[PDB]
Design a protein around this nucleic acid. Structure first.
Lengths: 51, 223, 150, 117
RNA sequence: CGCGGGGUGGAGCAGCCUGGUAGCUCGUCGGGCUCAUAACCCGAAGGUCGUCGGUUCAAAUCCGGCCCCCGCAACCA
RNA sequence: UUGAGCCUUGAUGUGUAGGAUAGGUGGGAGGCUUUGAAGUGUGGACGCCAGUCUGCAUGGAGCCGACCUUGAAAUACCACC
């Protein structure tokens, strides 16, 4: 995870709720070097039903 | 140094390096006293003779005009008329089986204990309570004998008892600093000639390595 | 694993209203008779006033407020290997652990009257010497040289 | 020497060791401690206890320098990070400058399932 | 020609300054373990801690002698 | 900068058990403290966790053996090593 956040924490991190297995987070979208591309999709949003 | 006021005022009379002749200092020994208890002059001898081997261990006692610096209260364990002979010679308490209960329970008002050989059957049961006090009689050093009247008198007349310590050293008192300094040169020879007759059987060549003499927490004297 | 269990806190003693005396007669219960234990513990004060026991407010409190156990010993696994590790004593056996250390020390002693062996064991806890009080100290002295694991 | 009331620090924790070092901004050594200096070995040398005791051994090396605030750097993933930072208060320190100095050294990846636990 | 240490079930070693007190490894007779065999672990059986003096309520032990061992050792005509 | 050595200074002693860190060894009851401890607490330090040293709030000549108990054996106050 490689984080630099310091001071007011306990219990040796893993602070994000539902981060691995059966979602969250990512692997939606696991193949072809696109692993971190759904974070970009849900930030460039705008609508999700597009024509 | 760093020294206490009681002794700092005595350095106002005496030199820190000089050891004084016992034939010349005869008015000075009484003059360097400062304590709230009685100060003495004591002899320190270096040995030997072998510094480890217990076959060359030195033990004994010697008679002196003032003994240990006081008179002693002597007790005698003896049955029948021979006890009255020790009571008239130097004993202040006569002992029997009735007294062996008190000594074992813890109470004893005497400096020396003497016994006769047929009375020593009782005293043999006190060897572990009289042991750690040096108070137990033993035939092998003469403190058990039929002539108990002369043995209580030997203690009451004033004697000092000794034995050498670790690595071969021995220390004994030879007078109070207030007592006649003229006699120190006389009584020292009576102590030395008697300690020199106490040489071990397997002693060879030499016996004394060094002699020193000093006052309680005070200056040294020369011979 | 699962469970999550129901637990019991037991009935108080029918003379004094004390549940601490009730747990003491339960640890003193042998052969299931249970009335026998009432006649052994708190059945005399004249036998505690025979030794070190001073006034009735201390005739049972010498097994309660006189001590505080904290840890137990034995080994525990950490990763791929086992180590000697002091473990945290649970907060309701905390006040009822020394009851076994007193009842065992009296029961296994060869000195006749059991009602008197127990009053003598309470007297030897009122001086804070040897039995039960050193069974607290021995494991605390161990845990003062064993701290890396819990 | 003399009172300075200033210094800099380094605190590291891994899954095999933990250490504490205090120095000056002119490069002078002021105090050091390690879990091996605390006398620990093997699977016990990375514990959060081994880190919290080493923190006070370094606070005893700097004791005459007058230091209450020092500029800290933090290294390594190990749980000794959390107890060595709490031990700054048991050392008498109150901080205003602290940064993570751990090498990244590349992008990502794959957070583990062991250590913790 | 001398000195230090040693004498303990079947072989080789403890020690000291807890004197109220025989410890051990190795083997042997048996288990754990094992598909056995190796590696590691621990029950059981058997001896006067030599020997003559000594202190003592008491020494295999300490203090004196002896003897056999194990290591070091020196000189006048 | 330090090897060896000598004075000065300061403290050594907890086999083991509890009230208790009984050094050796010989004495011995009135001897020592007035920035001086007691005693419960926020603190510092060595630790064999018993003890001791220092600081502050304080209170200000005690305290101790003998008594009472523990043990073959003592436990204020002290030479000597």
């Amino acid at each position: 995870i490689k984080v630099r956040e310091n001071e007011p924490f306990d219990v040796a991190l893993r602070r994000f709720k539902r981060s691995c297995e059966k979602a969250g987070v990512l692997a939606e979208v696991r193949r072809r070097e696109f692993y971190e591309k759904p974070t970009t999709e849900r930030k460039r949003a705008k609508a999700s039903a597009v024509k | 140094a760093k020294l206490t006021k009681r002794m700092r005022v005595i350095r106002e009379k005496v030199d820190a390096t000089k050891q004084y002749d016992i034939n010349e200092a005869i008015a000075l020994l009484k003059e360097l006293a400062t304590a709230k208890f009685v100060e003495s002059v004591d002899v320190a001898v270096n040995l030997g003779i072998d510094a480890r081997k217990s076959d060359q261990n030195v033990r004994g006692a010697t008679v002196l005009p003032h003994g240990t610096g006081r008179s002693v209260r002597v007790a005698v364990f003896t049955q029948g008329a021979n006890a009255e002979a020790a009571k008239a010679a130097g004993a202040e308490l006569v002992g029997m089986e009735d007294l062996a209960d008190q000594i074992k329970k813890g109470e004893m008002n005497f400096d020396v204990v003497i016994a006769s050989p047929d009375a020593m059957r009782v005293v043999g049961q006190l060897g572990q309570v009289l042991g750690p006090r040096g108070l137990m009689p033993n035939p092998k050093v003469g403190t058990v004998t039929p002539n108990v009247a002369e043995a209580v008198k030997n203690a009451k007349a004033g004697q000092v008892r000794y034995r050498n310590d670790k690595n071969g050293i021995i220390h004994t008192t030879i007078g109070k600093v207030d007592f006649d300094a003229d006699k120190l040169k006389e009584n020292l020879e009576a102590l030395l000639v008697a300690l020199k007759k106490a040489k071990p059987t397997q002693a060879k060549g030499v016996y004394i390595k060094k002699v020193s003499i000093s006052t309680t927490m005070g200056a040294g004297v020369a011979v | 694993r699962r469970r999550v269990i129901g637990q019991r806190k037991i009935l108080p003693d029918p003379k004094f209203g004390s549940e601490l005396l009730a747990k003491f007669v339960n640890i003193l219960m042998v052969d299931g008779k249970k009335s026998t234990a009432e006649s052994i513990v708190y059945s005399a004060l004249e036998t505690l006033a025979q030794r070190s026991g001073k006034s009735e407010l201390e005739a049972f409190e010498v097994a309660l407020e006189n001590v505080r156990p904290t840890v137990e010993v034995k080994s525990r696994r950490v990763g791929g290997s086992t180590y000697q590790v002091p473990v945290e004593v649970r907060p309701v056996r905390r006040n009822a652990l020394a009851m076994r250390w007193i009842v065992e020390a009296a029961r296994k002693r060869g000195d006749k009257s059991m009602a008197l062996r127990l009053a003598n064991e309470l007297s030897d806890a009122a001086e804070n010497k040897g039995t039960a009080v050193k069974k607290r100290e021995d494991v605390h002295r161990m845990a003062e040289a064993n701290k890396a694991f819990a | 020497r003399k009172q300075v009331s200033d210094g800099v620090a380094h605190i590291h924790a891994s899954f095999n060791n933990t250490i504490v070092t205090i120095t000056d901004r002119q490069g002078n050594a002021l105090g050091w401690a390690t879990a091996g200096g605390s006398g620990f070995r093997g699977s016990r040398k990375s514990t959060p206890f081994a880190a919290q005791v080493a923190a006070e051994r370094c606070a005893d090396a700097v004791k005459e320098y007058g230091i209450k605030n020092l500029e800290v750097m933090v290294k390594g993933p190990g749980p000794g990070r959390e107890s060595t930072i709490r031990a700054l208060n048991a050392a008498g320190f109150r901080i205003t400058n602290i940064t993570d100095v751990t090498p990244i050294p590349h992008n990502g990846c794959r957070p583990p399932k062991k250590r913790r636990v």
